[PDB]
Amino acid sequence: FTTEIHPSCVTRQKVIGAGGEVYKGMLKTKEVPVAIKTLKAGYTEKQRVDFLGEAGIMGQFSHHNIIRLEGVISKYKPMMIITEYMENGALDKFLREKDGEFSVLQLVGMLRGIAAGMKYLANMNYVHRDLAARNILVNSNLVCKVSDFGLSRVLIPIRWTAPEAISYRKFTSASDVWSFGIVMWEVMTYGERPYWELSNHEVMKAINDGFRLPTPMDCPSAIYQLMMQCWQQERARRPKFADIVSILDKLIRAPDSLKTLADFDPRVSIRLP
Numbered sequence: 001f002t003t004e005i006h007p008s009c010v011t012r013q014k015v016i017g018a019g020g021e022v023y024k025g026m027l028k029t030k031e032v033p034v035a036i037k038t039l040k041a042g043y044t045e046k047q048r049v050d051f052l053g054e055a056g057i058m059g060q061f062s063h064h065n066i067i068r069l070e071g072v073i074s075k076y077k078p079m080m081i082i083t084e085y086m087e088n089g090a091l092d093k094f095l096r097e098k099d100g101e102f103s104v105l106q107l108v109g110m111l112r113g114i115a116a117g118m119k120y121l122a123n124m125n126y127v128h129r130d131l132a133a134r135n136i137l138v139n140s141n142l143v144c145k146v147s148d149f150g151l152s153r154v155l156i157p158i159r160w161t162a163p164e165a166i167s168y169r170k171f172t173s174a175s176d177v178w179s180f181g182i183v184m185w186e187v188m189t190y191g192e193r194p195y196w197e198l199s200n201h202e203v204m205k206a207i208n209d210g211f212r213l214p215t216p217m218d219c220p221s222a223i224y225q226l227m228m229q230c231w232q233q234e235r236a237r238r239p240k241f242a243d244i245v246s247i248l249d250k251l252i253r254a255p256d257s258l259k260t261l262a263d264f265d266p267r268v269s270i271r272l273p
């Protein structure tokens with residue numbers, strides 16, 4: 001049972017997104033900021049199962065890097081899912097708005113947090129299917145938390161998705177590891193679009209041909225090596241999230257290890273005599 005919140009305790013203050021709206025608001029239980037997702041009159045049976053299913057999933061979880069469920073409004077209409085407020089919004093937009101503003105150690109710490117959340121989910125037998133920086137939220141302590149929970153409602157996003165999931169719909173924690181590799185590239189590039197302007201068909205062709213994303217600028221060699229191992233075609237060869245967490249924790253605890261950078265391939269020549 002999730003916590004049932006009375007609507008008098010919830011003050012919607014401003015629209016912060018869509019998913020039928022997501023609000024920033026306050027929750028009285030002194031008041032605390034929350035995110036508030038609503039479900040309007042006329043919702044179908046499937047919408048209700050998906051909506052409360054998302055809450056039911058999140059209520060089973062208790063981890064630092066997983067968005068916390070404060071409670072639900074289900075006895076009154078419109079129904080609401082109330083979650084912890086993440087002041088800095090989605091990670092992809094956050095990185096793009098803060099280009100170059102963080103240390104390599106901060107960026108890798110963000111990835112460690114995401115990986116710890118994903119290790120928790122996988123161990124809990126939850127396959128995310130839509131892991132991407134756009135679905136990771138950032139708070140005012142720079143902590144990154146996996147969000148976007150549900151079933152059929154979360155989705156395919158081709159350039160984040162593992163080949164076996166594209167080709168025959170096999171979604172597992174190992175296809176989430178592939179996605180996590182893409183998220184590593186997103187973070188280290190401050191939110192560049194994976195595969196830039198290649199079309200979805202061109203991306204799948206490139207992957208099948210063996211091509212992989214090139215090294216980000218200023219990227220520790222150990223970090224590029226780890227994301228490349230996330231992108232092994234053979235599922236069984238990919239690291240598990242336990243391995244990823246272990247490696248990232250060891251790199252962070254010996255931070256001089258991150259000063260060794262992978263070579264960056266320039267896509268431009270500048271010659272000055």
Ligand SMILES: CO[C@@H](C(=O)N1Cc2[nH]nc(NC(=O)c3ccc(N4CCN(C)CC4)cc3)c2C1)c1ccccc1
Binds near residue numbers: 022085134
């Ligand atoms: C659709 O569900 C929401 C959801 O569940 N959630 C739960 C939850 N908690 N906290 C949230 N914060 C924000 O959505 C948010 C958005 C923009 C924001 N500002 C925008 C302008 N920027 C310049 C500064 C930052 C600041 C905070 C959300 C959303 C969701 C949204 C995005 C990714 C994952 C989930």
